[PDB]
Structure 1
Amino acid sequence: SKVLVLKSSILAGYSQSNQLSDYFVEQWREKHSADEITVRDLAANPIPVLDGELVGALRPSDAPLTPRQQEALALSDELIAELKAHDVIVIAAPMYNFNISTQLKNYFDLVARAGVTFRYTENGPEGLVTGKKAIVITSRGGIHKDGPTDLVTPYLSTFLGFIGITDVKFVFAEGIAYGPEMAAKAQSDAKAAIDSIVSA
């Protein structure tokens, strides 16, 4: 198949989720070497903030668009085509201030578009990005998993399910802020979880 890797950390080479994404990539190339892999780093190639002007680019219109709107529309179309073009979608979602990173959020805000990645319907909202497996690699400083301060995990499930990606496996790298021994254990635990997704 084709694997999409989205990175969203603001910590570059020091990023725990990026080191895990990279590992994922190495393991996929090893086991499934026909497959092509695309990596988009939403920190190194930043998506603009959704503001009052750019939101108009995302609505179906025959009104003229400002230069920024045109650019934001073309960038929207490129992100969505890329997303639809891949089978396995890997999303690094570090938690910052109990949310995902703004770098990832801006990608979602350009990707969620009525009549393109979802559509309204007699029988509720329906997702149009179909037939995908998503793996979410989520790194955190503290320990949040299965608890009430983990809003990141239910939100990703909600947003991805919305646009049609309902097959999502979460990999967790938690306790990073406790120091290098805990960071190393997180990496080792998370790497075993990846190993079994890849070898399934």
Structure 2
Amino acid sequence: MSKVLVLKSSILAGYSQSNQLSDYFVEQWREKHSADEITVRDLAANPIPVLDGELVGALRPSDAPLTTRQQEALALSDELIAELKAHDVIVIAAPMYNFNISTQLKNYFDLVARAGVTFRYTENGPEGLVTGKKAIVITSRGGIHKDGPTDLVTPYLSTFLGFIGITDVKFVFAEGIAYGPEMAAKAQSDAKAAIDSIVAA
């Protein structure tokens, strides 16, 4: 029995291509794996704060008193990390905005990456502590970037996720959305088929 976490990060709400595919993933997983628990967190509808010079100190082990704002960010970081570690299958919807991930997803990563909690340093290098996960990235783009030099999102996601221990990552692409409704529909169909194959594994 698995627990599935779905992280939505688009700023386009119900018009989001990656959210539509995330919803399809959930629908198909419920159908094929009816006993599994599914948790969805919308990082745009419930925003994570920007990591600034005040919040960064909240995420360090210290005996120093924290500000109210720091205490709340620490509580949120702990909540996010507990949630991430409590689920088995992690689905990350990651649209490409100005050649980067969305800030909504980035703020989540910046509260989740914490030394001694989601990674630690050993005598022979970094070690990720978020273990036993299988990750699916659903990444939507207006243009066509896959396997080219302008896709920095894919290797960045592999790098960041691997650093915290999530090395088993399958990518689902929905590209060419900006070329119009016909190409957006083909991207949806192609990504749905990649999802079907993952759900059928």
TM range (shorter): over 0.9
The DSSP-based 3-state class of the residue aligned with 1:94 is coil
Distance in 1 of aligned mates of 2:3 and 2:113: 21
Distance in 1 of aligned mates of 2:100 and 2:200: 30
The DSSP-based 3-state class of the residue aligned with 1:47 is coil
Q: Which residue of 1 is the match for residue 166 of structure 2? A: 165
Tell me the alpha carbon deviations over residues 113-143 of structure 1, each in whole angstroms, 9 at most, x when there is no partner. Answer: 0000000001100000000000000000000
Q: Which residue of 2 is the match for residue 127 of structure 1? A: 128
Distance in 1 of aligned mates of 2:124 and 2:158: 20
Listed as ranges, the gaps of 5+ residues in structure 1 are none
Distance in 2 of aligned mates of 1:132 and 1:55: 26
Q: Which residue of 2 is the match for residue 10 of structure 1? A: 11
Written as runs of structure 1 = structure 2, the 5 A alignment for 1:34-73 is 34-73=35-74
- What percent of counterpart residues are identical? 99
Q: Aligned Cα RMSD in Å?
A: 0.2
Quote how far apart the aligned CAs of 1:24 are.
0.1
Q: Give the TM-score normalised by the residue count of structure 2.
A: 0.99
Distance in 2 of aligned mates of 1:186 and 1:122: 45
Q: 4+ residue runs of structure 1 moved beyond 6 angstroms?
A: none
Quote how far apart the aligned CAs of 1:42 are.
0.1
The DSSP-based 3-state class of the residue aligned with 2:111 is helix
Quote how far apart the aligned CAs of 1:38 are.
0.2
Tell me the alpha carbon deviations over residues 169-196 of structure 1, each in whole angstroms, 9 at most, x when there is no partner. Answer: 0000000000000000000000000000
Q: Which residue of 1 is the match for residue 146 of structure 2? A: 145
Q: Give the TM-score normalised by the residue count of structure 1.
A: 1.00
The DSSP-based 3-state class of the residue aligned with 1:5 is strand
Quote how far apart the aligned CAs of 1:31 are.
0.2
The DSSP-based 3-state class of the residue aligned with 1:78 is helix
Distance in 1 of aligned mates of 2:96 and 2:165: 23
Tell me the alpha carbon deviations over residues 73-123 of structure 1, each in whole angstroms, 9 at most, x when there is no partner. Answer: 000000000000000000000000000000000000000000000000011
Listed as ranges, the gaps of 5+ residues in structure 2 are none
Count of aligned positions: 200
Distance in 2 of aligned mates of 1:123 and 1:88: 28
